[PDB]
Design a protein around this ligand. Structure first.
Ligand SMILES: *[C@@H]1O[C@H](CO)[C@@H](O[C@@H]2O[C@H](CO)[C@@H](O[C@@H]3O[C@H](CO[C@H]4O[C@H](CO)[C@@H](O)[C@H](O)[C@@H]4O)[C@@H](O)[C@H](O[C@H]4O[C@H](CO)[C@@H](O)[C@H](O)[C@@H]4O)[C@@H]3O)[C@H](O)[C@H]2NC(C)=O)[C@H](O)[C@H]1NC(C)=O
Ligand SMILES: *[C@@H]1O[C@H](CO)[C@@H](O[C@@H]2O[C@H](CO)[C@@H](O[C@@H]3O[C@H](CO[C@H]4O[C@H](CO)[C@@H](O)[C@H](O)[C@@H]4O)[C@@H](O)[C@H](O[C@H]4O[C@H](CO)[C@@H](O)[C@H](O)[C@@H]4O)[C@@H]3O)[C@H](O)[C@H]2NC(C)=O)[C@H](O)[C@H]1NC(C)=O
Ligand SMILES: *[C@@H]1O[C@H](CO)[C@@H](O[C@@H]2O[C@H](CO)[C@@H](O[C@@H]3O[C@H](CO[C@H]4O[C@H](CO)[C@@H](O)[C@H](O)[C@@H]4O)[C@@H](O)[C@H](O[C@H]4O[C@H](CO)[C@@H](O)[C@H](O)[C@@H]4O)[C@@H]3O)[C@H](O)[C@H]2NC(C)=O)[C@H](O)[C@H]1NC(C)=O
Ligand SMILES: CC(=O)N[C@@H]1[C@@H](O)[C@H](O[C@@H]2O[C@H](CO[C@]3(C(=O)O)C[C@H](O)[C@@H](NC(C)=O)[C@H]([C@H](O)[C@H](O)CO)O3)[C@H](O)[C@H](O)[C@H]2O)[C@@H](CO)O[C@H]1O
Ligand SMILES: CC(=O)N[C@@H]1[C@@H](O)[C@H](O[C@@H]2O[C@H](CO[C@]3(C(=O)O)C[C@H](O)[C@@H](NC(C)=O)[C@H]([C@H](O)[C@H](O)CO)O3)[C@H](O)[C@H](O)[C@H]2O)[C@@H](CO)O[C@H]1O
Ligand SMILES: CC(=O)N[C@@H]1[C@@H](O)[C@H](O[C@@H]2O[C@H](CO[C@]3(C(=O)O)C[C@H](O)[C@@H](NC(C)=O)[C@H]([C@H](O)[C@H](O)CO)O3)[C@H](O)[C@H](O)[C@H]2O)[C@@H](CO)O[C@H]1O
Ligand SMILES: *[C@@H]1O[C@H](CO)[C@@H](O[C@@H]2O[C@H](CO)[C@@H](O[C@@H]3O[C@H](CO)[C@@H](O)[C@H](O)[C@@H]3O)[C@H](O)[C@H]2NC(C)=O)[C@H](O)[C@H]1NC(C)=O
Ligand SMILES: *[C@@H]1O[C@H](CO)[C@@H](O[C@@H]2O[C@H](CO)[C@@H](O[C@@H]3O[C@H](CO)[C@@H](O)[C@H](O)[C@@H]3O)[C@H](O)[C@H]2NC(C)=O)[C@H](O)[C@H]1NC(C)=O
Ligand SMILES: *[C@@H]1O[C@H](CO)[C@@H](O[C@@H]2O[C@H](CO)[C@@H](O[C@@H]3O[C@H](CO)[C@@H](O)[C@H](O)[C@@H]3O)[C@H](O)[C@H]2NC(C)=O)[C@H](O)[C@H]1NC(C)=O
Ligand SMILES: *[C@@H]1O[C@H](CO)[C@@H](O[C@@H]2O[C@H](CO)[C@@H](O)[C@H](O)[C@H]2NC(C)=O)[C@H](O)[C@H]1NC(C)=O
Ligand SMILES: *[C@@H]1O[C@H](CO)[C@@H](O[C@@H]2O[C@H](CO)[C@@H](O)[C@H](O)[C@H]2NC(C)=O)[C@H](O)[C@H]1NC(C)=O
Ligand SMILES: *[C@@H]1O[C@H](CO)[C@@H](O)[C@H](O)[C@H]1NC(C)=O
Ligand SMILES: *[C@@H]1O[C@H](CO)[C@@H](O)[C@H](O)[C@H]1NC(C)=O
Ligand SMILES: *[C@@H]1O[C@H](CO)[C@@H](O)[C@H](O)[C@H]1NC(C)=O
Ligand SMILES: *[C@@H]1O[C@H](CO)[C@@H](O)[C@H](O)[C@H]1NC(C)=O
Ligand SMILES: *[C@@H]1O[C@H](CO)[C@@H](O)[C@H](O)[C@H]1NC(C)=O
Ligand SMILES: *[C@@H]1O[C@H](CO)[C@@H](O)[C@H](O)[C@H]1NC(C)=O
Lengths: 317, 172, 172, 317, 172, 317
């Protein structure tokens, strides 16, 4: 004359192993994955403004390499550099390439404003067959190759004040001829000098004559440099030869823009987190896809799986 | 495991309990039955959903950073860029590993706790009318039909109604 | 919450208990009363003060460091200086958030534990002379005036003195 | 015939919400704040030695800009640079300004020992109206502007051994004239050269003639450089023009000194932790005032509040 | 400490128990004795060895890194190299300090738990034949010779054999 | 007529104090040490390949300082630099010494392949009494000191293509004479120039004539530079004087090699973890021996002891 009442808990036939403080592997009824380990392989074109660089690196679009003319005045949240990109203008180098690429990438714009520099006494718009634009010998669109006029090259001494309320980025250069005949033919003097200064800073570059390895038709080179001018400051360009002059300035902005090396295709979808492998969801706190990321992303970790228990210990019969 | 109910004095779980995490099985004069306890079930689920919501709380948003892959050998500055990133990844990997270990240890203990709490709540209801058989079951020393069992499951069991009958059966 | 006393089988706290964290309320032949239990109160306070002293243990002392704000755009080296600091801040912010979550979970459980321990200590004193009513109260089955209640509160209650009277009342 | 004995716990009418592992917001009886979020706005002048730079940056006090003469031979635990500071001597630049500022700041002293360099054959103590000291044209107090004597400038070749037991910091410079007439007038030769060497290291700087933007009366500039000489090593200065010579050395120390950019006023109080916002208490483990700090400080975190429970769950009736 | 057994209602440990962590002491008609309980002992050891194996799990392997000591003053880049390393060391030192504090708190609580579990298992075996004296000891209200005590220690005690004798002694 | 059955736990007479969340010091029955704080003082020669540099720094073994001839073509997992090392050849400097030391150390090999550069028109293998090899004046074994032949020094313009499938490291240099007579005697022209270029990069160094402090017999110097050439790229060396030419290339590898400053002796034992203090065991997760480490090592922490409880609270009577 009585009853039995038993207390108890559920179980499942298919439990899942998790780690604890005390156990490398203990079975619970359910768990959820905390490490994002897959990607669709596509960079979603929303919500960030993606600019596909295609055949152009950011620096070649900045300087104005002819096949990069379509990038004039472009904007981006994320500039995507493709591994197939190539230069096809005058062979060049950028001392501290990495820094110029970074500061332009972070600025997020190639917005360019022409300025009327006073180049009285020299010929402008030098060109080369290494840098063709359609049918004609040409040059970087944002740079101005100066050379002798009527067999003279006077000491250039020109100024450009920043009377606005925002910063100006100036890209300029120095020409390295391959022989002494080139040097005297272009600049009369046996050696040049380029000095670009502000109230507070100065850069002097002395060109170097000599052969470099043949690239796109030429053994000569140009070297690229940059100068930022704040409001109330003044740019002063002083040269007696080999100057590759700016045509104006780039507007510098601050904000959330950046640049990524990736060959992933761009698709029509929305994703906050971008990796070079493609966009990834961000519902999990960690990810093992790529330490390189952009946007609202899970944190990169070495583990490819981390199971968070969402149920009790599984004790079957 | 720290209370000793789940995987302890309760020998195993019930695969046939599909409508709750915790509950009651009974045998009486009218047969046998099983019923899920929703309050204890919900208490454990609420806690697990709370910890899940915290773990996924907010996604850091990062924009321009440092470079992390390099095509040219450079030396000092590249050594430092690589070391900074490797240092960061190792520490976040440590945080992730520890977080899951601590959370999973705590989830196993809290679910064990909720099982123990339901057992202790039932024991207290029964007063002097039942004895703990040591395996999660109470031997109830009086006639306890389906409504009576139901009264225990919904917290309205009146121990005074049955005390005389139960004491008589318990003590010879 | 993990023992099920505070916010569990004890329905609510006592705002009128101002001289202790835990204690006793009684009703007997001489009236009603309330008294704080100092040992359990002090045990929980000592533990909380221990964890507080650890959290504030030692202040790192740092002198010359790196720059963290910049008036000029510079590129690579400034990117790395900023990234190092942002990395550090995010990890310390994670440590601070986790520390407080873990400590607060533990503080709630330890204070629940101390309440349960006092209840279990009282239950054990009373032996066969009282029954647990299920809400944190014992029904004491014998005359228990103010000195008797006092004997329970200070751990000197002699259950043998009252056992005969209590057994008679308990079992009809 | 019996009694009732109820066990229980306290509550308060005014609980406080805290976060836990499982609960974003749960009420406990009390809590304490772990993030220091306020400042009095004053930098306490104890226990660290505060040196208010006032109108002077550290570098201008180092070089000896006349309005910074009061900083000669000063010491500090924390040098405070004010945003109103200004240079008022010869317009100049420091390649790697940031590093020289840092190593002097960390050294914590401007202690300067004159040394008798042998400048036979040149005139010393060149001056400029851009750098007035009272009524007279003058120059940086720790630098020595050398120029022609009797229309010659011989190849300078002078040495200064470090026979002591501590390191010597030498600050020196190069003058950039604005025109060729200046160059020949001051140094005879059409171009100068400055080489400063030790047993193990060398620096050569070639000056560059040309206009820079007008600053404090001048289109010319000077460029600042530095050389450390260890015990048993020797300084050798070699120049055929444009040398801005050191007058001696700065004693380099190691220790706990540093530098901070702040406009906060200095007050009479004691505080171990200094931020640019002012001193802050350090009784809490974290702070949200400023990532820039000096001394025994809480750790900077992004959160502006973190409540540590100091009591049980609050369960009122 | 969170269950209140070790350093709680069990007054002290037994230095003379050398063959186990937990166990039984008895007094009966044939004398007194002590015996270790291997299952509870092993359960606590297994857990501690599990946490020890996790703490020593894997050694990071690092090869070429950054420089960390310097013979020349250099300024900016050296400031950053030093700051990166000091940042890393402080965070790992924090992880190590927290890890040991959490693990040691948990080890003390789990070993307390295993003691409580053995006590509760023994209580449940004894049913109505013994009463909890409040200090970790049961008063057993029937003749219980060495084999009987042995039956309790190995989980085969049959409470029905002694219930009549025990009830008679318990209730006058 | 009854029995007593008491439940209980063990204790030990010699407990050990540990830290917890709530207690700075609480006694448990046992604990284990988690911080490795000692070293045997010996670097175990297994399992990593240890190369004891002895009297040679890595850079001096690279360049080929005569007393370092035994290091030609050596390999290592860990190169150990001793504090007694010394240079004993031509006094030199390396701009960015730290980076060249690092990239060679990480490469882990001095494997050198001679290449037949076309030095028609100059004399090869210049030597100096500052760099004796046995009885004869000599020079760095991997460098080739070029100078006039029959009182001329033509414009050198030589090339070396990388037609293989791996990278080439070239070490080269520039000679700084101490006087004009040296310059004209060695290179005819009043000033030299060294330009080393690839398709994508270029370096030009102009030597500087003048006295430096006397070192090993000389007031002149050489300056060391380096150029990496990838497969399909080409090295071009262009100079009209002061060139210190490479004799070939070093094979660059990637892998686990590195370099350590240590005076600890090398012993016959096996140890995964190496510190400058000596090898340490790696059974503990943390260590307080040295923040400098190599191999599979515990993590460095500031604490010199951390006790992990391995037993219950100790409650004696
Ligand atoms: C310093 O030393 C360097 C190295 O010796 C010299 O640099 C070389 O200069 C010559 C110019 O005289 C360069 O010659 C040119 O090579 C180009 C590359 O050709 C490659 O591709 C073809 C297939 O398309 C292969 O067959 C070939 O082997 C190469 O792999 C050619 O495109 C050029 O040819 C065109 O112009 C010539 C006219 O000169 C015609 O005859 C051709 O038919 C064609 O129209 C040209 O031959 C050579 O590439 C340079 N080498 C390097 C490594 O840069 C410097 O000139 C020297 N400096 C001084 C001052 O002497
Ligand atoms: C390369 O090109 C640059 C740019 O054109 C030239 O640099 C200029 O050089 C002239 C000197 O000939 C500088 O002129 C000086 O400007 C000073 C700044 O004046 C500012 O403030 C006043 C109010 O106080 C304003 O009205 C004025 O517009 C400016 O905003 C003046 O202080 C100077 O004036 C004093 O001296 C002259 C005598 O020359 C008197 O007439 C005045 O009354 C007063 O006493 C002076 O006029 C000019 O500032 C320079 N510009 C820049 C940008 O640097 C280089 O000279 C040139 N190089 C070569 C080799 O030709
Ligand atoms: C620019 O200015 C610097 C500094 O004045 C000049 O550099 C000095 O040049 C002279 C050479 O004329 C160097 O003199 C040499 O010093 C060597 C170092 O000797 C040290 O060790 C000995 C003990 O062994 C001590 O007694 C001594 O005091 C030193 O501490 C000596 O080894 C040389 O001596 C040998 O050669 C001479 C022949 O010249 C013999 O007489 C000796 O017996 C011995 O065989 C020699 O005397 C001097 O060290 C240089 N100093 C520095 C700091 O570099 C430059 O020459 C000058 N430039 C110009 C263009 O003038
Ligand atoms: C200026 C000119 O027409 N010179 C003739 C050359 O064609 C020739 O040397 C040949 O030069 C070729 C490259 O020539 C250009 C180029 O890069 O396209 C021609 C450009 O108009 C010129 N631009 C300017 C502003 O001067 C440019 C410039 O001088 C260099 O790029 C500077 O480095 O050179 C190519 O290299 C051929 O291989 C080469 O033979 C010379 C002598 O042969 O004759 C000139 O009439
Ligand atoms: C040396 C001198 O007296 N020259 C006369 C100049 O006054 C004048 O050119 C004027 O120069 C002005 C600046 O002159 C100083 C200066 O900076 O104060 C005068 C200093 O004594 C001189 N110091 C030395 C050691 O030579 C200094 C120096 O040459 C330069 O700073 C080097 O860059 O120049 C100011 O620029 C006026 O605007 C300018 O007209 C010339 C020609 O006018 O006459 C000289 O008699
Ligand atoms: C070339 C030569 O034999 N010159 C004679 C010199 O002995 C002497 O000047 C003395 O030079 C000494 C150092 O001489 C060497 C050296 O460094 O050993 C001799 C080397 O053969 C030479 N190597 C080459 C390729 O030319 C080397 C070189 O010129 C320099 O190292 C370049 O900086 O110089 C030492 O310095 C003595 O102190 C010095 O007197 C001169 C004039 O005395 O006579 C020459 O016959
Ligand atoms: C996302 O993309 C990254 C970057 O491309 C992928 O990581 C890369 O994975 C490849 C695997 O093919 C690694 O290269 C291989 O390494 C092995 C040795 O581990 C070697 O035997 C092969 O010959 C090849 O070189 C590569 O190192 C690695 N890169 C980095 C920077 O880690 C990753 O797999 C992608 N993830 C997803 C989910 O798509
Ligand atoms: C301590 O001082 C720091 C540094 O000055 C203070 O942080 C700064 O707070 C200001 C708020 O006025 C931030 O500037 C503002 O930003 C907002 C957007 O967030 C913009 O709309 C405003 O026009 C203005 O630019 C500034 O970014 C921030 N600086 C840094 C480095 O974080 C801080 O508030 C002070 N704290 C205390 C307790 O005094
Ligand atoms: C492993 O080797 C490291 C590096 O040599 C040792 O650390 C060094 O310990 C010495 C102790 O003699 C420190 O130098 C001394 O500092 C005190 C002040 O703290 C000063 O009064 C003395 O005159 C002397 O300068 C030195 O700073 C320290 N180096 C570093 C980089 O921390 C370490 O002790 C060795 N550990 C073992 C287990 O062998
Ligand atoms: C509850 O917490 C509050 C705030 O954390 C405590 O108030 C502090 O009390 C101390 C001691 O009297 C004062 O020195 C502080 O200035 C107070 N701080 C604040 C922010 O008010 C309070 O003492 C704690 N205890 C109780 C029982 O309320
Ligand atoms: C208690 O801890 C100590 C030290 O952590 C242990 O002693 C170690 O014992 C192992 C196995 O016998 C030896 O290999 C080690 O060399 C010992 N280490 C030290 C530092 O002495 C001990 O075994 C632990 N257990 C007990 C029961 O004491
Ligand atoms: C431009 O430069 C020339 C030459 O120096 C000068 O004559 C002219 O006035 C300057 N300005 C303009 C607007 O041409
Ligand atoms: C509880 O169960 C009894 C018996 O089935 C039923 O009569 C009663 O209505 C229920 N009450 C509540 C509050 O659930
Ligand atoms: C305990 O309380 C009783 C009754 O009030 C009192 O007589 C006795 O002295 C107290 N003893 C202790 C140890 O507190
Ligand atoms: C200083 O230099 C001159 C010129 O070189 C020299 O004649 C003189 O001896 C040197 N020493 C002293 C003390 O004048
Ligand atoms: C338990 O102990 C009893 C009494 O000593 C003994 O007879 C029996 O064989 C034991 N059984 C088991 C399963 O240990
Ligand atoms: C080496 O250089 C000389 C001079 O330029 C040249 O005549 C010769 O052909 C080149 N090649 C060889 C193999 O000598």
């Amino acid at each position: 004359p009585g009853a039995t009442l038993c207390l108890g808990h559920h179980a499942v036939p298919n439990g899942t192993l998790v780690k604890t403080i005390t156990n490398d592997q203990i079975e619970v009824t359910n768990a959820t994955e905390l490490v994002q380990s897959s990607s669709t392989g596509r960079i979603c074109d929303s919500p960030h403004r993606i600019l596909d660089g295609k055949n152009c690196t950011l620096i070649d679009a900045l300087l104005g390499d002819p096949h990069c003319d379509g990038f004039q005045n472009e904007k981006w949240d994320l500039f995507v550099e493709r591994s197939k990109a190539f230069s096809n203008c005058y062979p060049y180098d950028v001392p501290d390439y990495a820094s110029l690429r970074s500061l332009v990438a972070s600025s997020g714009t190639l917005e360019f404003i022409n300025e009327g520099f006073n180049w009285t006494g020299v010929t402008q718009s030098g060109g080369s067959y290494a840098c063709k634009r359609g049918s004609d010998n040409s040059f970087f669109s944002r740079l101005n190759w100066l050379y002798e006029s009527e067999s003279k090259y006077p000491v250039l001494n020109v100024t450009m004040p920043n009377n606005g309320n925002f910063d100006k980025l100036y890209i300029w250069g120095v020409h390295h001829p391959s022989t002494d005949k080139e040097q005297t033919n272009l600049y009369v003097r046996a050696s040049g000098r380029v000095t670009v200064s502000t109230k507070r800073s100065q850069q002097t570059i002395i060109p170097n004559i000599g052969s470099r390895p043949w690239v796109r038709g030429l053994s000569s080179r140009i070297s690229i440099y940059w100068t930022i001018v704040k409001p109330g400051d003044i740019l002063l360009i002083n040269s007696n030869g080999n100057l590759i002059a700016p045509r104006g300035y780039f507007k510098i902005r601050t904000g959330k823009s950046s640049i990524m090396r990736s060959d992933a295709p761009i698709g029509t979808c929305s994703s906050e987190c971008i990796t070079p492998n493609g966009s990834i969801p961000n519902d999990k706190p960690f990810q093992n896809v790529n330490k390189i990321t952009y946007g609202a992303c899970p944190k990169y970790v070495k583990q490819n799986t981390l199971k968070l228990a969402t149920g009790m210990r599984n004790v079957p019969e | 495991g720290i209370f000793g109910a789940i995987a302890g004095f309760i020998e195993n779980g019930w695969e046939g309990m599909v409508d709750g995490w915790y509950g009651f099985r009974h045998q009486n004069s009218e047969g046998t039955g099983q019923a899920a306890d929703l309050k204890s079930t919900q208490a454990a689920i609420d806690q697990i959903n709370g910890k899940l919501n915290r773990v996924i709380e907010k996604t850091n948003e990062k924009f321009h950073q440092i470079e992390k892959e390099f095509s040219e050998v450079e030396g000092r500055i590249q050594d430092l860029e690589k070391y900074v990133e490797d240092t960061k990844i190792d520490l976040w990997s440590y945080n992730a590993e520890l977080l899951v270990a601590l959370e999973n240890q705590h989830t196993i203990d809290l679910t064990d706790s909720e099982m123990n709490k339901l057992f202790e709540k039932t024991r207290r209801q029964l007063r002097e009318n039942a004895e703990d058989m040591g395996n999660g079951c109470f031997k109830i020393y009086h006639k306890c039909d389906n409504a009576c069992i139901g009264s225990i499951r919904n917290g309205t069991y009146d121990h005074d109604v049955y005390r005389d009958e139960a004491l008589n059966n318990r003590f010879q």
